[PDB]
Amino acid sequence: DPILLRPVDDLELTVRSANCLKAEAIHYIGDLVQRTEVELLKTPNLGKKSLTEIKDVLASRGLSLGMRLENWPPA
Amino acid sequence: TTESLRAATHDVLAGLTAREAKVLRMRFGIDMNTDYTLEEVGKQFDVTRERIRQIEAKALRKLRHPSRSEVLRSFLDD
Amino acid sequence: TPEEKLLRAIFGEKASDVKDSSLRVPNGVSGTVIDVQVFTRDGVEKDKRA
Amino acid sequence: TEFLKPRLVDIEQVSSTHAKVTLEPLERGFGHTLGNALRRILLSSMPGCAVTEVEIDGVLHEYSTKEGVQEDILEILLNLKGLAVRVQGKDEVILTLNKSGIGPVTAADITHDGDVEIVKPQHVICHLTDENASISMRIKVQRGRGYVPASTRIHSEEDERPIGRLLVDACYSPVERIAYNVEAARVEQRTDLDKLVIEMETNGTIDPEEAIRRAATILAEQLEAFVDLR
Amino acid sequence: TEFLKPRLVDIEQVSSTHAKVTLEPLERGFGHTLGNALRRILLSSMPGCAVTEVEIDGVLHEYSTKEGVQEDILEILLNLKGLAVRVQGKDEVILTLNKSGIGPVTAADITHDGDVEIVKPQHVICHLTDENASISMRIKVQRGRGYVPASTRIHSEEDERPIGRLLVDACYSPVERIAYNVEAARVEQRTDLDKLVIEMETNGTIDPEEAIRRAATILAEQLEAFVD
Amino acid sequence: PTLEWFLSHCHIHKYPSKSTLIHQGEKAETLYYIVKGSVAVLIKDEEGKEMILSYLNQGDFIGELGLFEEGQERSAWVRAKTACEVAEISYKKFRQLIQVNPDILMRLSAQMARRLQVTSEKVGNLAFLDVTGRIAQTLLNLAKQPDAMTHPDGMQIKITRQEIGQIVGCSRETVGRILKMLEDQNLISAHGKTIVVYGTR
Amino acid sequence: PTLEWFLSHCHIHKYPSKSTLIHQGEKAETLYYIVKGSVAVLIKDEEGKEMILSYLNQGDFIGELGLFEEGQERSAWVRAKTACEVAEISYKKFRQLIQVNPDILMRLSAQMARRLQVTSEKVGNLAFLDVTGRIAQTLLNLAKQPDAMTHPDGMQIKITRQEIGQIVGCSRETVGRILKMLEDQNLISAHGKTIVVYGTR
Amino acid sequence: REEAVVWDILDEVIREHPVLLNRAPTLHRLGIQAFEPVLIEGKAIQLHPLVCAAYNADFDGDQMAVHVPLTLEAQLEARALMMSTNNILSPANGEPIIVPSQDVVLGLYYMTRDCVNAKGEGMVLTGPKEAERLYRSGLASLHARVKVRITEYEKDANGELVAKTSLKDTTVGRAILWMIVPKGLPYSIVNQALGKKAISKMLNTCYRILGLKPTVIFADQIMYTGFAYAARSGASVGIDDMVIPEKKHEII
Amino acid sequence: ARVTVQDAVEKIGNRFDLVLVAARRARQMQVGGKDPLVPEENDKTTVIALREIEEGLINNQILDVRERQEQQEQEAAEL
Ligand SMILES: Nc1ncnc2c1ncn2[C@@H]1O[C@@H]2COP(=O)(O)O[C@H]2[C@H]1O
Ligand SMILES: Nc1ncnc2c1ncn2[C@@H]1O[C@@H]2COP(=O)(O)O[C@H]2[C@H]1O
Ligand SMILES: [Mg+2]
């Protein structure tokens, strides 16, 4: 999709969550959605609420978590 | 074009925290005959200078954010 | 103005120190280019196509 | 009701293009009612195959020229609008032509595809005055009906085409001249009955009986809207 | 082949006998075709029954007259062309009217066979000024199609008729008027398209929609041999 | 949209956990809506043992079977899966706004049709399958329910032996033993409360 | 009424006894209404054992779950009890019927209410009571019907041990044995298919 | 980019939005008028021929100018003061300035005419319509005195109509032409071959009696049919229409 | 009403007062957004003005009365 290929700062993320993302080598939103929730919760600084509001904003702009890709990355 | 532009800008400014919007107004001479500075934001808000630079940055995230960008996007082709 | 000042403070975009002065079709017109001619001074480089 | 239908009889091919159709038997008021009504359709809404594009080596625009040739590009193009070609299988073809030597350039010289009929080999195209000179082109033909000019295409077509493709207007409408005559179809008694005799003149490229069949077919297709749709 | 077809949009109907029809959209070159051809078949080939001949007692030729009557013979004859008649079993009938008194002579007073419908039974025919005058007539109605005048009929007729039997221009085809109009209708990029607006106005005996339906029915019924 | 016009009219109460929503047999006089949270519908027997009817998530009008005939009762218990904000509707007003707008019984056509469809295979499975199939397809359907979380090899969910024993119609340690067999069959991972199924999607 | 307006517009059809009305698995495109007669609902399993779910007489709606959800499959079997007659219309008309007057789906909502509550009594009775309990209670149940015939000491109904075995879900012959137990206790009489029940009224 | 909604919205705004037309030299106030727009696929204005005369205008290469009433008040003044309906008469004199010019009038004078010669003389009609059946069939002369029935009206009462019918020995084209007339005028007005003057005072009478609007409508019909039958009429010129009197040479 | 403005004049009596009153109403409607009385029928505010004035629903007196009453009641609401 045209929205697979965006950096996450178009979502206007937060500093703690941003540190969580850059800390975990998660580059593309296609790389985001291929990651699973429990693969996030165990990670540093990602407990209750990061998952809450990131779930909110992805509920806003029409996508969800944990989805599955194929032919990734086209780069 | 200038008018509809500027009104849209102020309508984006309304949605922020107070210090954010007022700082980002007077820091650029917006809405006044003034032209106020990072240093002078130090003088008025509180002497902290470059956290205002980081605040400017954070606001640019808060506002650029392509859910608000698209009233501004027509003005990209300016 | 403070506004566009803020806008390229957002996008970081900029101008050059140069303006456009191109030759264009005037509105309402369409047609077929078939020949071009160029004239240049004895003393300045002939721009390559010349 | 003392109705009676008209039934085809004969076709008299005076020539490839010039040919008439004696047609009978009609009641009163139907000779003209069918004459004009079919004239309009045979003239207006008949399809055919005609050139729409050409492309030539060594050329940018149709106003340019060529060594070893009399004709400007335009005169050749206009000598290609009026070409007579029939396709059977396809809805588009791209032919080619290649020639050298001093002489008149006609259609017999063309790279003919297997599934295409040229009606006249001697549709004159160009003339060659230099021995050494050489011509080579491609010819896109399509199929359609009516008048469809190039300028309406580029008006429609934003596709930034490659320079060289010299574009051409389309007159798909194949019929040229056409008439009818309301004579008196003989029945013994009902001698008010009429025969319609339709004089037809077109290019090649189009069968007459099939033409009439398409005309009447289209007509009935338009009449369903007055019999079925109320 | 990239034909377009119309969609019958409206049938605006003032009375039962007066009717309007808008009709769009059409490729250019058909509105006049359809309007003309239908106008022809309508006005010159639609079947129907009508007053062919008359026979009245004490009545010889139209230039003569009856006594105790408002009309001459002629105004009556015009009050007979304007008649709504339907035969339902036959192709021919002969009605009778025997009237007296000062009754402005309606078609209601007529004695009707079972296979006859007069759609305008109020239709006035004559007027008996004094009551003492009383009439007996008989009216041939015949089934045909189109219009044919009694003048051309006597030109046609060599078989002897007497003085007493009269003849009227046959109004078989139930239309009184039609006219069409080619307007231009819009498709978004295409204003070169044309609609066909029709006014038809008939006698009784038919609803106009049905009449047109029969006309196109006839015409396709002529075309089936060349759709082939 | 639609939902705005209908929440415009409603009266609300906030529900704590651990308690009762519906009392079976009492006068059914109100329809409800799940404003937020989840719930577990169920029913008792003479002896008092519980046996779960289903769970329910967001997007549910609740307490509907009493809407319809004059003088009906509550045909089931409904118990707290979580704390839940819940709406309030009367039935004369139900006549009013079904009449001036027919889209709400279009919605209840949606929900109730789902409920007797899912119940259709509840009883349809209740006839035939074996306990393997009972709890297996049970946890498949709970893997379809959104209350489960995503595990990188499948779906994780948190539940005890007792309540699933109240799902499939058997005892708790029976499902414990066949569960551990199912672990040995390599179709789940299982630590106490937190159980996980793989093979989803 | 008002049903006059409804069936004035419907498409009408008759069909004989034991014909297959609805096929489990076909698409959701048509509602049906029993105009005259009775019909029986059953289901089918991997094994082919048939299990009568319900049975309904004149004045009831059939084909109701698929009305809303675009492209559902038929979640059960329904076969003719007798030669019987039905009116039918498809779904695109019923949106015109709910948008103009939602009373029809009130009627459907009430019969569907009684439906789902007797389904609750069904799954409970199937769940807890012993064989004698639910066979006895379902005997009490079909004693209610208009199909049931009057007897000076109570009622009498014709049914085989097979089909009653298909509503309780056990073998016809064990139903024979418990029938003998109930004849020994002087509560029911029976010859072949004609059972005669005391205690009613 | 000239998208599709451009055109639909153009048609959306233009409706009920009049527009001004002007030809030089703007001598008198009827040289400048307010019409309604009609959109067409061309680069050339069309115009309502009858109002060429107030413009003294012809289609010999002339050019006209267009202005726009932006503000609402000018728009209403345009629809009410500069409108083509409000102005059919001069303030200099009260003559019709809607005088049918040169083609329509030929169609009339050809149609309403009383020959002797063609055919269909001396039968009888119940009205105009079956006459239309005849000529649209092509059975009668268009110009031939024949008996018909008609039904005129009259407002003898307190501006209240007073009906009647009768017979007339009058031509076919005149009967056909009676279809349009608005229920207040005699039949004598059409009972002649309708020279240009007869039409001028025709419209005069229609105005003076009925008020305005039928005189407009009437007139439009009179334009259309006049062209139409004129195209039917057949018309040309040729060297033998110009005939030399034999007795010129000898006078000389 | 659209193509001819006669009957409107027959109601009031003058072109000028007709266009002034009509423009006043259609400026209550073009900007003030107040509702019409005669149906809409897909027409710009000119026609609806001329109709409301044709059938006798709007007049300079009537406009004065309406604006008067709402103004005065507003003055009561202020105090
Ligand atoms: N089979 C079922 N499926 C879904 N919900 C049910 C079922 N049985 C009962 N309920 C719910 O439990 C409620 C108990 O009271 P009511 O009968 O008023 O309405 C009932 C429904 O909301
Ligand atoms: N629990 C049930 N009780 C009664 N009838 C049912 C049940 N489940 C399915 N059916 C019937 O089976 C039919 C299958 O298709 P429908 O869902 O359209 O309509 C259904 C009902 O007629
Ligand atoms: Mg001039």
PDB file of C-alpha atoms in Angstrom, chain C residues 6-15:
ATOM      1  CA  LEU C   6       7.456  29.312   9.747  1.00  0.00           C
ATOM      2  CA  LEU C   7       6.534  27.003   6.865  1.00  0.00           C
ATOM      3  CA  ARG C   8      10.063  26.542   5.615  1.00  0.00           C
ATOM      4  CA  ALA C   9      10.928  26.360   9.287  1.00  0.00           C
ATOM      5  CA  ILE C  10       8.652  23.277   9.142  1.00  0.00           C
ATOM      6  CA  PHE C  11       9.630  21.642   5.861  1.00  0.00           C
ATOM      7  CA  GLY C  12      13.144  23.103   5.680  1.00  0.00           C
ATOM      8  CA  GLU C  13      12.602  23.843   1.961  1.00  0.00           C
ATOM      9  CA  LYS C  14      14.440  26.814   0.459  1.00  0.00           C
ATOM     10  CA  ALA C  15      14.869  29.017  -2.574  1.00  0.00           C
TER      11      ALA C  15
END
